[PDB]
A paper describes a structure:
IPS-1/MAVS/VISA/Cardif is an adaptor protein that plays a crucial role in the induction of interferons in response to viral infection. IPS-1 (as it will be referred to from hereon) is a 62 kDa protein containing an N-terminal CARD domain, a proline-rich region and a transmembrane domain that targets it to the outer mitochondrial membrane. The CARD domain of IPS-1 interacts with the N-terminal regions of RIG-I or MDA5 most probably through homotypic CARD-CARD associations, and both CARD domains of RIG-I are required for the interaction with IPS-1 CARD. The proline rich region interacts with a number of signalling molecules including TRAF6, TRAF2, RIP1, FADD and TRAF3, suggesting that IPS-1 plays a role in TLR3-mediated pathways in addition to TLR-independent, RIG-I/MDA5-mediated signalling. It has also been demonstrated that both the IPS-1 CARD and C-terminal mitochondrial membrane-targeting domains of IPS-1 are essential for IFN-β induction.
Numbering used by the authors: 2 to 462
Write the structure that this text describes.
Amino acid sequence: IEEGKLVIWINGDKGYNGLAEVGKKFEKDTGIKVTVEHPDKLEEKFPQVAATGDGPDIIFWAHDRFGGYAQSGLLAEITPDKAFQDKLYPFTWDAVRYNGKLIAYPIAVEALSLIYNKDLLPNPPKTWEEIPALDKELKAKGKSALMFNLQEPYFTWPLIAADGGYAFKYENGKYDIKDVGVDNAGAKAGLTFLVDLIKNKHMNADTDYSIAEAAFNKGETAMTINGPWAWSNIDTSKVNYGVTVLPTFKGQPSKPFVGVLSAGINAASPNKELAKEFLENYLLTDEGLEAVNKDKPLGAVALKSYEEELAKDPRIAATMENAQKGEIMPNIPQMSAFWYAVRTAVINAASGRQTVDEALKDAQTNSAMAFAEDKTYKYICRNFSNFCNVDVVEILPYLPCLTARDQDRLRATCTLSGNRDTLWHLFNTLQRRPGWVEYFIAALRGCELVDLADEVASVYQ
Ligand SMILES: OC[C@H]1O[C@H](O[C@H]2[C@H](O)[C@@H](O)[C@@H](O[C@H]3[C@H](O)[C@@H](O)[C@@H](O[C@H]4[C@H](O)[C@@H](O)[C@@H](O)O[C@@H]4CO)O[C@@H]3CO)O[C@@H]2CO)[C@H](O)[C@@H](O)[C@@H]1O
Protein backbone atom coordinates (compact mmCIF):
# COMPACT_ATOMS: atom_id res chain seq x y z
CA ILE A 1 0.00 0.00 0.00
CA GLU A 2 1.47 3.34 -1.14
CA GLU A 3 2.02 6.02 1.53
CA GLY A 4 0.85 9.57 0.76
CA LYS A 5 -2.13 8.63 -1.45
CA LEU A 6 -5.58 7.14 -0.84
CA VAL A 7 -7.00 4.17 -2.72
CA ILE A 8 -10.73 3.50 -2.21
CA TRP A 9 -12.83 0.48 -3.18
CA ILE A 10 -16.62 0.97 -3.57
CA ASN A 11 -19.18 -1.25 -5.33
CA GLY A 12 -19.99 -0.57 -9.00
CA ASP A 13 -23.69 0.09 -8.29
CA LYS A 14 -22.79 3.08 -6.05
CA GLY A 15 -21.92 6.67 -7.04
CA TYR A 16 -18.18 6.16 -7.46
CA ASN A 17 -17.90 9.15 -9.85
CA GLY A 18 -19.51 11.42 -7.25
CA LEU A 19 -17.09 9.92 -4.70
CA ALA A 20 -14.16 10.69 -7.08
CA GLU A 21 -15.29 14.37 -7.05
CA VAL A 22 -14.97 14.33 -3.27
CA GLY A 23 -11.48 12.83 -3.80
CA LYS A 24 -10.48 15.64 -6.19
CA LYS A 25 -11.56 18.26 -3.69
CA PHE A 26 -9.52 16.38 -1.05
CA GLU A 27 -6.48 16.50 -3.37
CA LYS A 28 -7.00 20.30 -3.94
CA ASP A 29 -6.83 20.97 -0.19
CA THR A 30 -4.25 18.40 0.98
CA GLY A 31 -2.15 17.48 -2.06
CA ILE A 32 -3.17 13.81 -1.55
CA LYS A 33 -4.41 12.00 -4.64
CA VAL A 34 -7.54 9.87 -4.20
CA THR A 35 -8.13 6.98 -6.55
CA VAL A 36 -11.63 5.50 -6.44
CA GLU A 37 -11.96 1.93 -7.81
CA HIS A 38 -14.95 -0.41 -8.18
CA PRO A 39 -13.39 -3.91 -8.56
CA ASP A 40 -15.57 -6.97 -9.14
CA LYS A 41 -16.09 -9.08 -5.98
CA LEU A 42 -14.32 -6.40 -3.91
CA GLU A 43 -15.89 -7.66 -0.68
CA GLU A 44 -14.26 -11.10 -1.27
CA LYS A 45 -10.98 -9.66 -2.58
CA PHE A 46 -10.60 -7.32 0.42
CA PRO A 47 -10.09 -10.05 3.05
CA GLN A 48 -7.73 -11.89 0.65
CA VAL A 49 -5.40 -8.95 -0.12
CA ALA A 50 -5.71 -7.22 3.28
CA ALA A 51 -4.55 -10.40 5.09
CA THR A 52 -1.24 -9.96 3.24
CA GLY A 53 -1.10 -6.21 3.99
CA ASP A 54 -2.20 -5.01 0.54
CA GLY A 55 -5.53 -3.67 -0.74
CA PRO A 56 -7.29 -0.31 -0.62
CA ASP A 57 -6.80 2.23 2.18
CA ILE A 58 -10.56 2.50 2.45
CA ILE A 59 -13.21 -0.11 1.73
CA PHE A 60 -16.95 0.60 1.28
CA TRP A 61 -19.57 -2.11 1.68
CA ALA A 62 -22.81 -2.55 3.62
CA HIS A 63 -22.00 -3.20 7.33
CA ASP A 64 -22.87 -6.95 7.25
CA ARG A 65 -19.40 -7.73 5.90
CA PHE A 66 -17.42 -5.76 8.50
CA GLY A 67 -17.63 -8.01 11.59
CA GLY A 68 -15.83 -10.71 9.60
CA TYR A 69 -13.15 -8.25 8.53
CA ALA A 70 -12.77 -6.93 12.09
CA GLN A 71 -12.49 -10.42 13.61
CA SER A 72 -9.63 -11.14 11.16
CA GLY A 73 -7.80 -7.93 12.31
CA LEU A 74 -8.20 -6.38 8.83
CA LEU A 75 -9.74 -3.05 9.92
CA ALA A 76 -8.30 -0.17 11.94
CA GLU A 77 -10.38 0.93 14.94
CA ILE A 78 -11.87 4.29 14.06
CA THR A 79 -11.42 7.21 16.44
CA PRO A 80 -14.01 9.96 15.81
CA ASP A 81 -14.26 12.38 18.68
CA LYS A 82 -17.59 12.89 20.47
CA ALA A 83 -18.51 15.96 18.42
CA PHE A 84 -18.13 14.07 15.14
CA GLN A 85 -20.04 11.02 16.48
CA ASP A 86 -22.85 13.42 17.43
CA LYS A 87 -23.22 14.35 13.72
CA LEU A 88 -24.47 10.87 12.77
CA TYR A 89 -27.55 8.92 13.97
CA PRO A 90 -26.75 6.65 16.93
CA PHE A 91 -28.47 3.71 15.21
CA THR A 92 -25.99 3.99 12.30
CA TRP A 93 -22.97 3.83 14.64
CA ASP A 94 -24.54 0.70 16.25
CA ALA A 95 -24.33 -0.96 12.77
CA VAL A 96 -20.54 -0.52 12.73
CA ARG A 97 -19.81 -1.35 16.38
CA TYR A 98 -18.24 -4.77 16.71
CA ASN A 99 -17.16 -6.22 20.10
CA GLY A 100 -17.52 -2.72 21.58
CA LYS A 101 -15.30 -0.93 19.06
CA LEU A 102 -16.23 1.31 16.09
CA ILE A 103 -14.78 -0.42 13.06
CA ALA A 104 -16.13 1.70 10.21
CA TYR A 105 -17.84 5.00 9.44
CA PRO A 106 -21.55 4.68 8.57
CA ILE A 107 -22.57 6.49 5.36
CA ALA A 108 -26.20 5.71 4.52
CA VAL A 109 -29.12 3.41 5.30
CA GLU A 110 -30.37 1.29 2.39
CA ALA A 111 -33.63 -0.61 2.16
CA LEU A 112 -35.35 -2.17 -0.89
CA SER A 113 -38.65 -0.66 -2.01
CA LEU A 114 -41.30 -1.42 -4.57
CA ILE A 115 -40.62 0.75 -7.62
CA TYR A 116 -43.51 0.95 -10.08
CA ASN A 117 -44.38 2.52 -13.39
CA LYS A 118 -47.27 4.95 -12.75
CA ASP A 119 -48.29 4.94 -16.41
CA LEU A 120 -48.71 1.14 -16.42
CA LEU A 121 -49.82 0.75 -12.83
CA PRO A 122 -51.10 3.98 -11.17
CA ASN A 123 -52.19 1.90 -8.18
CA PRO A 124 -49.55 -0.66 -7.26
CA PRO A 125 -50.61 -3.90 -5.55
CA LYS A 126 -50.59 -4.01 -1.77
CA THR A 127 -49.88 -7.80 -1.80
CA TRP A 128 -47.56 -10.31 -3.46
CA GLU A 129 -50.59 -12.61 -3.91
CA GLU A 130 -52.17 -10.26 -6.49
CA ILE A 131 -49.08 -10.24 -8.70
CA PRO A 132 -49.91 -13.45 -10.67
CA ALA A 133 -53.29 -12.12 -11.98
CA LEU A 134 -51.84 -8.64 -12.69
CA ASP A 135 -49.08 -10.27 -14.75
CA LYS A 136 -51.58 -12.32 -16.74
CA GLU A 137 -53.42 -9.11 -17.66
CA LEU A 138 -50.23 -7.19 -18.44
CA LYS A 139 -48.95 -10.13 -20.55
CA ALA A 140 -52.02 -9.62 -22.79
CA LYS A 141 -50.62 -6.16 -23.74
CA GLY A 142 -47.02 -7.34 -24.10
CA LYS A 143 -45.80 -6.25 -20.63
CA SER A 144 -45.18 -8.04 -17.33
CA ALA A 145 -46.03 -7.23 -13.68
CA LEU A 146 -42.69 -7.50 -11.87
CA MET A 147 -39.02 -8.19 -12.61
CA PHE A 148 -36.20 -8.01 -10.10
CA ASN A 149 -32.77 -9.61 -9.53
CA LEU A 150 -33.16 -13.28 -8.70
CA GLN A 151 -29.43 -14.03 -8.62
CA GLU A 152 -28.74 -12.32 -5.25
CA PRO A 153 -30.64 -13.40 -2.12
CA TYR A 154 -30.77 -9.79 -0.86
CA PHE A 155 -33.69 -9.11 -3.26
CA THR A 156 -35.61 -12.28 -2.34
CA TRP A 157 -34.94 -12.06 1.44
CA PRO A 158 -37.85 -9.56 2.07
CA LEU A 159 -40.33 -12.23 0.81
CA ILE A 160 -38.68 -15.17 2.67
CA ALA A 161 -38.72 -13.21 5.92
CA ALA A 162 -42.30 -11.82 5.56
CA ASP A 163 -44.14 -14.88 6.94
CA GLY A 164 -41.36 -15.81 9.40
CA GLY A 165 -37.96 -16.46 7.82
CA TYR A 166 -35.03 -15.00 9.76
CA ALA A 167 -31.20 -15.16 9.73
CA PHE A 168 -30.08 -15.17 13.42
CA LYS A 169 -32.36 -14.91 16.43
CA TYR A 170 -31.53 -11.95 18.63
CA GLU A 171 -32.04 -12.75 22.34
CA ASN A 172 -30.53 -11.47 25.61
CA GLY A 173 -28.14 -8.92 24.04
CA LYS A 174 -26.75 -11.27 21.38
CA TYR A 175 -27.37 -12.98 18.03
CA ASP A 176 -27.82 -16.70 18.54
CA ILE A 177 -25.58 -18.46 15.95
CA LYS A 178 -27.32 -21.76 16.74
CA ASP A 179 -30.91 -20.38 16.20
CA VAL A 180 -31.26 -19.86 12.40
CA GLY A 181 -34.50 -19.29 10.53
CA VAL A 182 -33.95 -20.17 6.84
CA ASP A 183 -35.85 -23.47 6.93
CA ASN A 184 -38.90 -22.74 9.05
CA ALA A 185 -42.48 -22.64 7.73
CA GLY A 186 -42.40 -18.90 6.98
CA ALA A 187 -39.19 -19.23 4.95
CA LYS A 188 -40.60 -22.10 2.88
CA ALA A 189 -43.87 -20.26 2.17
CA GLY A 190 -41.97 -17.21 0.90
CA LEU A 191 -39.62 -19.15 -1.38
CA THR A 192 -42.48 -21.40 -2.52
CA PHE A 193 -44.39 -18.31 -3.66
CA LEU A 194 -41.36 -17.10 -5.66
CA VAL A 195 -40.82 -20.53 -7.18
CA ASP A 196 -44.50 -20.62 -8.13
CA LEU A 197 -44.20 -17.23 -9.87
CA ILE A 198 -41.45 -18.80 -12.02
CA LYS A 199 -43.27 -22.17 -12.55
CA ASN A 200 -46.32 -20.16 -13.71
CA LYS A 201 -44.19 -18.08 -16.10
CA HIS A 202 -44.69 -14.74 -14.23
CA MET A 203 -40.96 -14.48 -13.74
CA ASN A 204 -37.81 -16.01 -15.29
CA ALA A 205 -35.24 -17.81 -13.02
CA ASP A 206 -32.28 -16.22 -14.78
CA THR A 207 -33.47 -12.58 -14.55
CA ASP A 208 -30.59 -10.67 -12.99
CA TYR A 209 -29.84 -7.06 -11.99
CA SER A 210 -29.19 -5.75 -15.52
CA ILE A 211 -32.13 -7.62 -17.09
CA ALA A 212 -34.61 -6.37 -14.46
CA GLU A 213 -33.21 -2.82 -14.70
CA ALA A 214 -33.34 -2.65 -18.54
CA ALA A 215 -36.91 -4.01 -18.59
CA PHE A 216 -38.17 -1.53 -15.99
CA ASN A 217 -36.32 1.47 -17.41
CA LYS A 218 -37.65 0.64 -20.93
CA GLY A 219 -41.27 0.43 -19.75
CA GLU A 220 -41.61 -3.32 -20.31
CA THR A 221 -42.38 -4.34 -16.72
CA ALA A 222 -44.70 -2.46 -14.36
CA MET A 223 -42.70 -3.05 -11.15
CA THR A 224 -39.22 -3.72 -9.89
CA ILE A 225 -37.57 -4.18 -6.49
CA ASN A 226 -34.43 -2.19 -5.91
CA GLY A 227 -32.67 0.22 -3.65
CA PRO A 228 -31.94 3.95 -3.78
CA TRP A 229 -28.85 3.60 -6.01
CA ALA A 230 -31.13 2.56 -8.94
CA TRP A 231 -33.18 5.79 -8.93
CA SER A 232 -30.92 7.95 -11.09
CA ASN A 233 -30.98 5.45 -13.97
CA ILE A 234 -34.80 5.58 -13.80
CA ASP A 235 -34.68 9.40 -13.69
CA THR A 236 -32.77 9.52 -16.99
CA SER A 237 -35.08 6.89 -18.59
CA LYS A 238 -38.13 9.17 -18.18
CA VAL A 239 -40.31 6.28 -16.92
CA ASN A 240 -42.84 7.97 -14.59
CA TYR A 241 -42.07 6.01 -11.39
CA GLY A 242 -43.17 5.87 -7.76
CA VAL A 243 -41.37 4.22 -4.88
CA THR A 244 -43.48 2.69 -2.15
CA VAL A 245 -43.87 -0.01 0.51
CA LEU A 246 -43.07 -3.57 -0.62
CA PRO A 247 -46.13 -5.80 -1.17
CA THR A 248 -47.24 -7.84 1.88
CA PHE A 249 -47.09 -11.65 1.88
CA LYS A 250 -49.63 -13.63 3.86
CA GLY A 251 -50.87 -10.34 5.28
CA GLN A 252 -47.45 -9.49 6.75
CA PRO A 253 -44.99 -6.79 5.58
CA SER A 254 -42.06 -7.81 3.42
CA LYS A 255 -38.98 -7.54 5.63
CA PRO A 256 -35.96 -6.31 3.74
CA PHE A 257 -32.58 -6.76 5.43
CA VAL A 258 -31.38 -3.22 6.00
CA GLY A 259 -27.80 -2.30 5.03
CA VAL A 260 -25.67 0.62 6.24
CA LEU A 261 -23.20 1.51 3.56
CA SER A 262 -19.99 1.88 5.60
CA ALA A 263 -16.39 2.82 5.02
CA GLY A 264 -13.61 0.92 6.86
CA ILE A 265 -9.92 1.76 7.05
CA ASN A 266 -7.49 -1.02 6.13
CA ALA A 267 -5.45 -2.00 9.25
CA ALA A 268 -2.40 -2.29 6.94
CA SER A 269 -2.87 1.30 5.54
CA PRO A 270 0.07 3.71 6.16
CA ASN A 271 -2.46 6.54 5.52
CA LYS A 272 -4.89 6.13 8.44
CA GLU A 273 -4.93 9.80 9.51
CA LEU A 274 -5.42 10.89 5.87
CA ALA A 275 -8.23 8.31 5.49
CA LYS A 276 -9.82 9.67 8.68
CA GLU A 277 -9.54 13.24 7.37
CA PHE A 278 -11.09 12.30 4.05
CA LEU A 279 -14.02 10.43 5.62
CA GLU A 280 -14.74 12.86 8.48
CA ASN A 281 -14.00 16.23 6.93
CA TYR A 282 -14.77 15.64 3.23
CA LEU A 283 -17.20 12.75 2.73
CA LEU A 284 -19.35 13.01 5.82
CA THR A 285 -20.35 16.61 5.15
CA ASP A 286 -23.49 17.98 3.45
CA GLU A 287 -21.35 18.69 0.33
CA GLY A 288 -19.52 15.31 0.23
CA LEU A 289 -22.68 13.23 0.52
CA GLU A 290 -24.55 15.52 -1.95
CA ALA A 291 -21.82 14.91 -4.51
CA VAL A 292 -22.15 11.12 -4.13
CA ASN A 293 -25.96 11.14 -3.85
CA LYS A 294 -26.29 13.20 -7.07
CA ASP A 295 -24.39 10.45 -8.87
CA LYS A 296 -26.37 7.47 -7.39
CA PRO A 297 -28.75 8.08 -4.51
CA LEU A 298 -27.35 6.90 -1.16
CA GLY A 299 -30.62 6.36 0.70
CA ALA A 300 -31.21 7.78 4.19
CA VAL A 301 -27.81 9.21 5.07
CA ALA A 302 -26.19 8.81 8.50
CA LEU A 303 -25.50 12.57 8.64
CA LYS A 304 -28.39 14.25 10.46
CA SER A 305 -28.07 17.66 8.81
CA TYR A 306 -28.31 16.23 5.30
CA GLU A 307 -30.96 13.60 6.11
CA GLU A 308 -33.37 16.38 7.38
CA GLU A 309 -33.58 17.44 3.70
CA LEU A 310 -33.64 13.91 2.16
CA ALA A 311 -36.46 12.94 4.60
CA LYS A 312 -38.77 15.40 2.69
CA ASP A 313 -38.48 13.23 -0.44
CA PRO A 314 -41.30 10.57 -0.76
CA ARG A 315 -38.80 8.02 -2.14
CA ILE A 316 -36.77 8.40 1.05
CA ALA A 317 -39.85 8.21 3.30
CA ALA A 318 -40.78 4.94 1.44
CA THR A 319 -37.20 3.66 1.95
CA MET A 320 -37.45 4.23 5.69
CA GLU A 321 -40.94 2.72 5.81
CA ASN A 322 -39.54 -0.46 4.26
CA ALA A 323 -36.57 -0.22 6.71
CA GLN A 324 -39.01 0.00 9.72
CA LYS A 325 -40.68 -3.19 8.51
CA GLY A 326 -37.35 -5.00 7.96
CA GLU A 327 -34.34 -5.45 10.28
CA ILE A 328 -30.88 -3.99 10.36
CA MET A 329 -28.50 -6.76 9.31
CA PRO A 330 -26.17 -8.27 11.90
CA ASN A 331 -22.53 -7.33 11.28
CA ILE A 332 -21.38 -10.67 12.72
CA PRO A 333 -18.70 -12.79 10.92
CA GLN A 334 -21.31 -15.54 10.24
CA MET A 335 -23.19 -13.20 7.88
CA SER A 336 -21.28 -14.19 4.73
CA ALA A 337 -21.90 -17.97 5.21
CA PHE A 338 -25.58 -17.21 5.80
CA TRP A 339 -25.78 -15.27 2.54
CA TYR A 340 -23.83 -17.94 0.52
CA ALA A 341 -26.23 -20.66 1.78
CA VAL A 342 -29.31 -18.57 1.00
CA ARG A 343 -27.97 -17.64 -2.47
CA THR A 344 -27.55 -21.34 -3.37
CA ALA A 345 -31.00 -22.20 -1.98
CA VAL A 346 -32.81 -19.50 -3.95
CA ILE A 347 -30.98 -20.16 -7.22
CA ASN A 348 -31.43 -23.98 -6.86
CA ALA A 349 -35.14 -23.66 -6.02
CA ALA A 350 -35.81 -21.05 -8.76
CA SER A 351 -34.02 -23.05 -11.46
CA GLY A 352 -35.67 -26.28 -10.28
CA ARG A 353 -32.43 -28.17 -9.38
CA GLN A 354 -33.95 -28.68 -5.90
CA THR A 355 -37.44 -28.40 -4.38
CA VAL A 356 -37.95 -25.48 -1.97
CA ASP A 357 -37.80 -27.94 0.92
CA GLU A 358 -34.53 -29.53 -0.27
CA ALA A 359 -32.99 -26.13 -1.00
CA LEU A 360 -33.78 -24.60 2.39
CA LYS A 361 -32.94 -27.77 4.29
CA ASP A 362 -29.43 -27.67 2.75
CA ALA A 363 -29.18 -23.94 3.48
CA GLN A 364 -29.90 -24.66 7.16
CA THR A 365 -27.54 -27.64 7.26
CA ASN A 366 -24.69 -26.12 5.30
CA SER A 367 -24.75 -22.71 7.07
CA ALA A 368 -24.79 -24.40 10.53
CA MET A 369 -21.85 -26.60 9.34
CA ALA A 370 -19.96 -23.45 8.13
CA PHE A 371 -20.49 -21.56 11.42
CA ALA A 372 -19.29 -24.57 13.42
CA GLU A 373 -16.23 -25.26 11.26
CA ASP A 374 -15.22 -21.55 11.17
CA LYS A 375 -15.54 -21.37 14.95
CA THR A 376 -13.38 -24.53 15.33
CA TYR A 377 -10.73 -23.23 12.94
CA LYS A 378 -10.66 -19.86 14.76
CA TYR A 379 -10.24 -21.76 18.06
CA ILE A 380 -7.38 -23.88 16.68
CA CYS A 381 -5.62 -20.72 15.50
CA ARG A 382 -6.00 -18.84 18.82
CA ASN A 383 -4.90 -21.94 20.75
CA PHE A 384 -2.19 -23.11 18.34
CA SER A 385 0.27 -24.01 21.06
CA ASN A 386 -2.21 -26.59 22.42
CA PHE A 387 -1.81 -28.38 19.04
CA CYS A 388 1.99 -28.25 18.57
CA ASN A 389 2.35 -31.85 19.82
CA VAL A 390 0.48 -32.89 16.65
CA ASP A 391 2.81 -34.69 14.21
CA VAL A 392 1.77 -33.92 10.66
CA VAL A 393 3.17 -37.14 9.16
CA GLU A 394 1.49 -39.32 11.89
CA ILE A 395 -1.91 -37.61 11.45
CA LEU A 396 -2.24 -37.74 7.61
CA PRO A 397 -3.38 -41.44 7.47
CA TYR A 398 -6.60 -40.40 9.33
CA LEU A 399 -7.49 -37.39 7.20
CA PRO A 400 -9.30 -38.70 4.08
CA CYS A 401 -10.74 -35.21 3.49
CA LEU A 402 -7.23 -34.16 2.29
CA THR A 403 -6.61 -34.89 -1.43
CA ALA A 404 -3.51 -36.71 -2.65
CA ARG A 405 -2.24 -33.29 -3.80
CA ASP A 406 -2.82 -31.83 -0.27
CA GLN A 407 -0.80 -34.70 1.28
CA ASP A 408 2.10 -34.30 -1.11
CA ARG A 409 2.22 -30.55 -0.58
CA LEU A 410 2.13 -30.97 3.21
CA ARG A 411 4.92 -33.56 3.09
CA ALA A 412 7.07 -31.10 1.09
CA THR A 413 6.24 -28.26 3.49
CA CYS A 414 7.27 -30.50 6.32
CA THR A 415 10.54 -31.35 4.53
CA LEU A 416 11.36 -27.71 3.86
CA SER A 417 10.02 -26.04 7.02
CA GLY A 418 9.54 -28.56 9.85
CA ASN A 419 6.46 -29.87 11.62
CA ARG A 420 5.48 -26.76 13.63
CA ASP A 421 5.35 -24.49 10.55
CA THR A 422 3.52 -27.24 8.59
CA LEU A 423 0.79 -27.54 11.27
CA TRP A 424 -0.39 -24.02 10.35
CA HIS A 425 -0.69 -25.14 6.69
CA LEU A 426 -2.35 -28.41 7.77
CA PHE A 427 -5.07 -26.49 9.60
CA ASN A 428 -5.38 -23.93 6.81
CA THR A 429 -5.79 -26.73 4.21
CA LEU A 430 -8.18 -28.81 6.37
CA GLN A 431 -10.58 -25.89 6.71
CA ARG A 432 -11.04 -25.67 2.91
CA ARG A 433 -12.15 -29.37 2.81
CA PRO A 434 -15.57 -31.06 3.38
CA GLY A 435 -16.22 -32.77 6.74
CA TRP A 436 -12.76 -31.84 8.11
CA VAL A 437 -13.69 -31.47 11.78
CA GLU A 438 -15.08 -34.98 12.23
CA TYR A 439 -12.01 -36.50 10.60
CA PHE A 440 -9.70 -34.19 12.57
CA ILE A 441 -11.35 -35.38 15.81
CA ALA A 442 -10.90 -38.97 14.54
CA ALA A 443 -7.27 -38.30 13.58
CA LEU A 444 -6.45 -36.88 17.00
CA ARG A 445 -7.99 -39.94 18.63
CA GLY A 446 -6.07 -42.17 16.17
CA CYS A 447 -2.83 -40.56 17.40
CA GLU A 448 -3.94 -41.07 21.06
CA LEU A 449 -4.44 -37.28 21.58
CA VAL A 450 -7.76 -37.75 23.33
CA ASP A 451 -7.83 -34.51 25.34
CA LEU A 452 -7.12 -32.57 22.16
CA ALA A 453 -9.84 -34.51 20.31
CA ASP A 454 -12.31 -33.76 23.11
CA GLU A 455 -11.31 -30.09 23.12
CA VAL A 456 -12.07 -29.93 19.37
CA ALA A 457 -15.41 -31.80 19.77
CA SER A 458 -16.31 -29.33 22.49
CA VAL A 459 -15.73 -26.25 20.34
CA TYR A 460 -17.39 -27.80 17.23
CA GLN A 461 -20.65 -28.60 19.05
O1 LIG B 1 -21.61 -17.31 -4.54
C1 LIG B 1 -20.55 -16.63 -5.22
C2 LIG B 1 -20.94 -15.16 -5.12
O2 LIG B 1 -20.31 -14.62 -3.94
C3 LIG B 1 -20.15 -13.19 -3.78
O3 LIG B 1 -21.31 -12.54 -3.18
C4 LIG B 1 -21.62 -12.84 -1.81
C5 LIG B 1 -21.01 -11.76 -0.88
O4 LIG B 1 -19.59 -11.88 -0.84
C6 LIG B 1 -21.58 -11.72 0.56
O5 LIG B 1 -21.14 -10.51 1.25
C7 LIG B 1 -23.09 -11.69 0.50
O6 LIG B 1 -23.53 -10.49 -0.16
C8 LIG B 1 -24.58 -9.77 0.50
C9 LIG B 1 -24.02 -8.41 0.91
O7 LIG B 1 -22.97 -8.59 1.88
C10 LIG B 1 -25.16 -7.57 1.53
O8 LIG B 1 -24.70 -6.27 1.95
C11 LIG B 1 -26.27 -7.40 0.49
O9 LIG B 1 -25.67 -6.74 -0.63
C12 LIG B 1 -26.49 -5.78 -1.26
C13 LIG B 1 -25.95 -4.41 -0.81
O10 LIG B 1 -26.11 -4.22 0.61
C14 LIG B 1 -26.64 -3.27 -1.57
O11 LIG B 1 -25.90 -2.08 -1.32
C15 LIG B 1 -26.60 -3.54 -3.07
O12 LIG B 1 -25.29 -3.32 -3.56
O13 LIG B 1 -26.99 -4.88 -3.44
C16 LIG B 1 -26.35 -5.98 -2.77
C17 LIG B 1 -26.94 -7.31 -3.29
O14 LIG B 1 -26.63 -7.45 -4.68
O15 LIG B 1 -26.76 -8.70 0.14
C18 LIG B 1 -25.79 -9.62 -0.44
C19 LIG B 1 -26.46 -10.96 -0.76
O16 LIG B 1 -27.23 -10.82 -1.99
O17 LIG B 1 -23.56 -12.79 -0.30
C20 LIG B 1 -23.14 -12.83 -1.67
C21 LIG B 1 -23.77 -14.11 -2.18
O18 LIG B 1 -25.11 -13.80 -2.57
C22 LIG B 1 -19.72 -12.52 -5.10
O19 LIG B 1 -19.71 -11.09 -5.00
C23 LIG B 1 -20.60 -12.95 -6.28
O20 LIG B 1 -20.16 -12.38 -7.52
C24 LIG B 1 -20.52 -14.46 -6.41
O21 LIG B 1 -21.41 -14.83 -7.46
